[PDB]
Amino acid sequence: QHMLRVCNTNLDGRRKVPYALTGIKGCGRRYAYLVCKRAGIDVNKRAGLMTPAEIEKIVDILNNPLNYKIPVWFLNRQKDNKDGKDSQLIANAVETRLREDIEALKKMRAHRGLRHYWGLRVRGQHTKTTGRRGR
Amino acid sequence: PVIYAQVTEILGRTGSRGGVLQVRCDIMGENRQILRNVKGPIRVGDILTLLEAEREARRL
């Protein structure tokens, strides 16, 4: 199957398994290699050669990292607010968590949130010369 | 049809700046003197290749 499907995200099957899991917006490269070792799936294999009987483990292993021996400092979302202290960010949830967070500062009218509204450099950089997108 | 010639003496450099040398050559086929404009490094000992030997490069 040349075009795989997992956690609503389509990955190219012409690459190796670790380098096709990078298609998921919540999983990069270091995370991708770890789940390959955790799931007991060879890294040298291609993603488009893997049986579907194990693909359901990868979607499970990403949405349930605590039970599968993953260090807590490897998580893209640590110390989550509104209860819960686990990432659960390996999904299209990366954008969902990002937007509502910026609005939290905007609701409270923080300086970082205020800079987000104006589309300015948030992290305190020199805006005099660099970042000259036309407007 | 290319006929070579032997550089005999160097007359000087011309062509605005110095990038062309005027040398009087002789063709070893018949010992015929010829004057040509040479581009590049040249000295007395070496020879030159002339695909055309009907022109005289005296430059007026």
Binding site: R14, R46, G48, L49 | -
Partner: protein
């Protein structure tokens, strides 16, 4: 623009094995262009055909692989 495929098929394997040894110079850079397959696969066939002895190596190292008939 190439899209030379990564997995093998009966079509090329029934034509690549009769003309690769007949070539004089065989290397992944020059062989992947003619049978329209990825040069990564050219590593597999060169070693696979080494077992059959159909192709004899003449320059093999960690940088380039050069084989001959």
């Amino acid at each position: 623009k190439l899209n030379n495929a990564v997995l093998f098929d009966k079509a090329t394997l029934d034509k690549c094995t009769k003309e690769v040894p007949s070539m004089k110079v065989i290397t992944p850079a020059v062989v992947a262009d003619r049978m329209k397959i990825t040069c990564s696969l050219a590593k597999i066939l060169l070693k696979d055909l080494e077992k059959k002895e159909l192709i004899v190596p003449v320059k093999v190292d960690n940088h380039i692989w050069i084989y001959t008939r």
